[PDB]
Design a protein around this nucleic acid. Structure first.
Ligand SMILES: Nc1ncnc2c1ncn2[C@@H]1O[C@H](COP(=O)(O)OP(=O)(O)NP(=O)(O)O)[C@@H](O)[C@H]1O
Ligand SMILES: Nc1ncnc2c1ncn2[C@@H]1O[C@H](COP(=O)(O)OP(=O)(O)NP(=O)(O)O)[C@@H](O)[C@H]1O
Ligand SMILES: Nc1ncnc2c1ncn2[C@@H]1O[C@H](COP(=O)(O)OP(=O)(O)NP(=O)(O)O)[C@@H](O)[C@H]1O
Ligand SMILES: Nc1ncnc2c1ncn2[C@@H]1O[C@H](COP(=O)(O)OP(=O)(O)NP(=O)(O)O)[C@@H](O)[C@H]1O
Ligand SMILES: [Zn+2]
Ligand SMILES: [Zn+2]
Lengths: 619, 619
DNA sequence: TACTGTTACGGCTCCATCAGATGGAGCCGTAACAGTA
DNA sequence: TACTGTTACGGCTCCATCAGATGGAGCCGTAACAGTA
């Protein structure tokens, strides 16, 4: 009737104990980097999967989850966790249809293109329209029909089998994954969903919530990690972590029904839910000053030759259902054209007639939708580009000049100035042939990543390792005088990473922390007073407080005289905009035209847009 | 609250529907080859495992269970099914201790025998008696300690790591497997145990029942297939199949509590439980006539130089705990010595001083404990040796003489007289690269396994395929005149296989059917009136009716003037014996001496033997 | 003289055990060139 | 003349995809030899 976890100390958990009810819809909420993903994925899912698969084949197991740093878990059950630009990965590989087709052509084929090029619906119709062949391929046909039906019911029936999954839209891919993993008709299995509401419109989120409720009604336990109010308002239990983030959080703050979290004063999530902390709605929207940017005849992806006008110098939001061509309209055409015109980028734009008003701008800055790449040779200091300035600082010291050390001698990724015993990693690489790997600190350099000769050179009494092993808040005061490093550190501090260290490995970063690192890196660049900001889904993996910080900095940038366009599905960002362009009304071939356009109130008055009705309800 | 199976037609199931309660101890009983193993293992376990692992890695899945021929299963949960003389398989490989030791020696070893040669207890004591080594091998040590503790608690703490698992006793190996598979502390998992009471004494069965009840109290479902009264008397639900075996059974006869099965008149299991059908206890035991067989100074395995005397010409049973040296005393010494003395076998006997009374015998016949080997090129006719006589019959026909066909032309395992299209298999070998294989009948020979030229030659109006595709009951009348084939078929009929066909592939045979085939093959040999029968666990995988048939034929053989020794743990066989030799009192190094010896009443009067107390309670 | 026991050899089949490689992209570091203020 | 945008190349690391081999034993078929009645 419960899952009792005792002595949970994985990552940043401060030896906490929880009692997660069974056969219930329970969410895990908190700040970015607070401990939700650790507590759920790295402990409960890991223990359940390991315990189940330990009673299985050893070779198959080698081809499981590592043991968490926990004392004991009671009431555990087998766990399934739903939770890349790869050219060699298409719809057929993900849905396994391509494997079935290859096997069928190898077995009963008579010595392909018409099936791969055909859509899901066309292929299903063709399949539905000597008995030895049927006897041989009865199971293949049954599996093909089941997979096609699941994909059609997932809301992505317009896709083609030969299309690459790297270019696949977030909503369609997420729906396909949910249909594949949820459709098993099992009972007594704990399901863990790590942020299952990314790249999904409100209607898609509602359909996913209905599907999850149906799955839970079978007699399962739903443990989802969510940041959206819609998900947390449709659950019977909430486990709130915190009270802060990073080393300042990792313990349970509040627990219970959403009303209990609302009444709880120690929970930031409850305060943001009730309304004690809220994003202020602008009383007076910024009216356009006559400066407009027009694109005529969009013909990229599912574009139906539409005309849209985006004002310059105001807050602009792009809305619509998943697959409605928001990215195709904004990124692939506008960003590429602006980059080619201004930054002299050698990139080919999308299919369009022409764009007016380009001369009104002077610079373009963009944040795409792809996540960042994780590597142990990177940290926030290297990612944001401030590490080069810090290395120049350390090479500008009198000791560095006297000893001849160059600017590249203070980096662990370049030989000649790093601990050669650990190859600059800082820890050894002891690995197990058939067991999860372990981390052992390197005793030659004691984890400082630099040898004695490098650490001898000190700037203001601190060597490179000390400044790498200290947080952004301290670096704000340490580098106050010098303007460039101060600006970069101030951007990192304002984006919300005032607790993280400058040398934390990116592989250990959370999704929200990496997202905020990317946002700070892109927004730390110089603005000339007339700049075009194109943000594509910036509030992903971000709590409402981080969303508030991002909205504040974006509005400060807008007030500085620049223009901002945000492709966001979040109502908090949408309600603060001054001009909303809506696309749709359906994903795929069913949409690609402007359902509505205007100020948020005008779009809300529109009775056709789903976003219009959602905005009317919100306002 | 239930598992609903509809349209179950795997193997010999006649499209039946069952409602198996959840979170209960439910057994599946019936005759040998009735449908228990199919219904449980091939349907419920298969569907549960496939449904769980379909939401897992594709490559790992290739390195699952085939889809059963069922309509739908409701209320399913992930399923774990507990259910060879391999020199390259020891205790370390089964318990995975050897892999851990090899990994530890590769990682922290300083550039083995003392650990492999040491027992489990010695190794545990040694392990329990720079911190970098402990940090590196903390998980390895924890896993080693957990496995050693589980093995010790399983009741097999005296074993050595270097000992081969092929020579491992049944009780110790079964206890180790149960400890390994049961110790996972999971909840909501269906456990399927296929005959978990083979090679186990009554005390070991009781300890296993206690362990299974403890495991079920966690909130799991126990679906065991059992033939022993002790297991079926400790369950809250019984699903009895039948009413016959083979093609005469496969449907549900009775279901409910053991009292309901007792009161049910249509169930054979209930009739045997209540006492309507029972094995008659001999009123007057066969007293020895002075003929005795003495072995002095046994020194094989855990033998403590004991003296035992086995009478000649009476029913003798060997009892004792698992590992008490029953096989070591009887088989390895007596059978080898008798074979070398009489049959001129070139085998080396065990370590003993000498054996008296060998000249009193004239022949030795034995049935060992190892199961039979499964191959698609064998059937009961080939296994029992009657196929050679049938082929000689078919080569003795006038058509065979006229056409020149030899005795080997009527076998599907020899080229030149078989369907070369299917290579004598009778079906094609269509295989899937990553899917379960399928069977397609060969259209060249229509499944008759023989070409037109071979099928032209007919004996008494029937060709070889027709006589191969007909049951033993028909073959009893067909071959009535000829004495050798009549004797072999009569042995096969009396052993209980009056429904099976003469050409059924052994790979499709059940455990009880293969066991009875082996018993018939060994007991069909000629007896000279003074023969020594050494049966080692003959009533394994056999229902009480098959046990009754075997007891009847054994007692007829004894009354014919021969001697029989049975190494059996079954009380039904034991209570009908005339002289019981008990070994023990503990398995492994803790036993190897005669706890008691005498008639069943005298051994029952003994207050030290566990078998004595069990016999006293039974009588 | 035939039936029955053994061994011996050739060919076919099942089962437990051992214990990854590759192409694509993303990131860090350095170099080079051009526009602007 | 310095700051900031781009491209271009070498080296390091993560992730999805492809889609078994071997030694041991057991069984069928045939041959060969020996004991017994
Ligand atoms: N190996 C590690 N050592 C120390 N801290 C770590 C380690 N790995 C992760 N952390 C930190 O632990 C905190 C919790 O991370 P995690 O639990 O994965 O994220 P989360 O709370 O689900 N947040 P987010 O994904 O951003 O919504 C973060 O501040 C991480 O930087
Ligand atoms: N390379 C491509 N070629 C053809 N069609 C594509 C391609 N990439 C995406 N599409 C389709 O174009 C439509 C719009 O996709 P896109 O505009 O990228 O999504 P989006 O609006 O950002 N939606 P989402 O990411 O879910 O919020 C969808 O039906 C996609 O499947
Ligand atoms: N492929 C098949 N086609 C037809 N009959 C089959 C096939 N496989 C197995 N059988 C028969 O189906 C019957 C049920 O076998 P099975 O269910 O495996 O045994 P069981 O009832 O558990 N008995 P046992 O193991 O002897 O205690 C037996 O008579 C088998 O010979
Ligand atoms: N080859 C061997 N070398 C040494 N010890 C052995 C060997 N085979 C078995 N043993 C041990 O000798 C003891 C008796 O085994 P054995 O007499 O073969 O079993 P059993 O009496 O038939 N018991 P069971 O089969 O469970 O009913 C056990 O402790 C075995 O582990
Ligand atoms: Zn080092
Ligand atoms: Zn054929």
């Amino acid at each position: 009737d419960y899952i009792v976890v005792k002595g949970a100390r994985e990552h940043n958990l401060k030896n906490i104990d929880v009692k997660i009810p069974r056969d219930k819809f329970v969410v895990i909420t908190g700040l970015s980097g607070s401990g939700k993903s650790s507590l759920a994925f790295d402990t409960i899912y890991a223990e359940g999967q390991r315990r189940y698969v330990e009673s299985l084949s050893s070779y198959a197991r080698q081809f499981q989850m590592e043991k968490p740093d926990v004392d004991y878990i009671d009431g555990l059950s087998p766990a399934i966790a739903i939770d890349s630009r790869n050219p060699r990965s298409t719809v057929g590989t993900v849905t396994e249809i391509y494997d079935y087709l290859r096997l069928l052509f190898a077995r009963i084929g008579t010595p392909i293109y018409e099936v791969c090029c055909l859509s899901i619906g066309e292929a299903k119709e063709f399949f539905a329209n000597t008995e030895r062949q049927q006897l041989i391929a009865r199971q293949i046909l049954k599996e093909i029909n089941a997979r096609l039906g699941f994909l059609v019911d997932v809301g992505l029936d317009y896709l083609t089998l030969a299309r690459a999954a790297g270019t696949l839209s977030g909503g369609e891919a997420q729906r396909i994954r949910l249909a594949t993993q949820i459709g098993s008709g099992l009972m007594g299995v704990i399901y863990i969903l790590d942020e299952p509401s990314i790249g999904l419109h409100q209607r898609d989120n509602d359909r996913l919530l209905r599907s999850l409720k149906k799955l839970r009604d079978l007699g399962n336990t739903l443990l989802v990690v969510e940041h959206d109010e819609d998900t947390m308002y449709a659950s019977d239990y909430i486990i709130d972590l915190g009270p802060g983030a990073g080393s300042h959080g990792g313990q349970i703050v509040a627990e219970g029904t959403v009303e209990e979290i609302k009444q709880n004063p120690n929970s930031v999530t409850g305060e943001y839910l009730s309304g004690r902390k809220k994003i202020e709605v602008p009383k007076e929207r910024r009216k356009p000053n006559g400066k407009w940017l027009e694109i005529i005849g969009a013909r990229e992806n599912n574009l139906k030759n539409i005309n849209v006008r985006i004002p310059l110098g105001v807050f602009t939001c792009i809305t619509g259902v998943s697959g409605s061509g928001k990215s195709s309209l904004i990124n692939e055409i506008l960003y590429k054209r602006l980059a080619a015109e201004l930054n002299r980028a050698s990139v080919k734009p999308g299919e369009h007639d022409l764009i007016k008003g380009i001369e009104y701008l002077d610079k373009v800055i963009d944040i795409d939708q792809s996540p960042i790449g994780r590597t142990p040779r990177s940290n926030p200091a290297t990612y944001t580009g401030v590490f080069d300035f810090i290395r120049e600082i350390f090479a500008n010291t009198t000791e560095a000049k006297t000893r001849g050390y160059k600017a590249g001698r203070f980096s662990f990724n370049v030989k000649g100035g790093r601990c050669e015993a650990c190859a600059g990693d800082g820890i050894n690489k002891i690995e197990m042939h058939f067991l999860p790997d372990i981390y052992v600190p390197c005793e030659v350099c004691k984890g400082k990543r630099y040898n004695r000769e490098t650490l001898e050179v000190r700037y203001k009494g601190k060597n490179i390792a000390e400044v790498l092993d200290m947080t952004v808040e301290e670096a704000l005061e340490f580098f106050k005088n010098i303007p460039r490093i101060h600006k970069k550190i101030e951007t990192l501090y304002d984006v919300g990473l005032g607790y993280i260290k400058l040398g934390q490995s990116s592989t250990t970063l959370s999704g929200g922390e990496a997202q905020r690192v990317k946002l700070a890196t892109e927004l730390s660049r110089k603005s000339t007073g007339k700049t075009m900001y194109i943000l594509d889904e910036p509030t992903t993996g971000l709590h409402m407080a981080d969303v508030h910080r991002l909205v504040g900095i974006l509005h400060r940038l807008v007030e500085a005289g620049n223009s901002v366009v945000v492709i966001e599905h979040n109502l908090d960002v949408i309600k603060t905009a001054d001009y909303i362009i809506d696309l749709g009304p359906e994903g795929g071939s069913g949409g690609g035209l402007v359902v509505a356009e205007g100020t948020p109130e005008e779009v809300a008055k529109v009775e056709n847009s789903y976003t219009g009705q959602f905005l009317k309800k919100v306002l």
